[PDB]
Structure 1
Amino acid sequence: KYNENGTITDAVDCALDPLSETKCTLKSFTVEKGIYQTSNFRVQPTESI
């Protein structure tokens, strides 16, 4: 978040928690009441065959 003088005054770490994910998805520091789709859960491979 850049203010009027171009100084970064805030930030969202998009991997910190599910609310941060919502804030990054909506490109906002405020999230309104509701349900939002932000990602896609995926099981990762553990072996190489």
Structure 2
Amino acid sequence: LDPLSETKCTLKSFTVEKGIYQTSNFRVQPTESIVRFPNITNLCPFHEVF
């Protein structure tokens, strides 16, 4: 629901005291999927034919 509840989840209690309480971990998850392999790799003779 909220980070105030994440504090009560990471530390088993309901009355939270005043302070910086570590709760979780951020991890930017990847957006795109880039897969680059080599250049050309055998060009076939469809040329001259067209």
With structure 1 as the length reference, what TM-score do the two structures score? 0.58
Aligned residues: 34
Q: More relative contact order in 1 or in 2 (CA 8 Å, sep 6+)?
A: 2
**Over the residues paired in the alignment, what is the CA RMSD in angstroms?**
1.1
Q: Where in structure 1 are there 5+ consecutive unaligned residues?
A: 1-15
Distance, in Å, in 2 between the alignment partners of 1:18 and 1:48 is 31
Percent of counterpart pairs with the same letter? 100
Moved beyond 4 Å, runs of 4+: none
Relative to its length, the structure with more strand (as a share) is 2
Unaligned regions of 5+ residues in structure 2, if any? 35-50
TM-score after normalising by structure 2: 0.57
Higher Cα Rg, which structure? 2
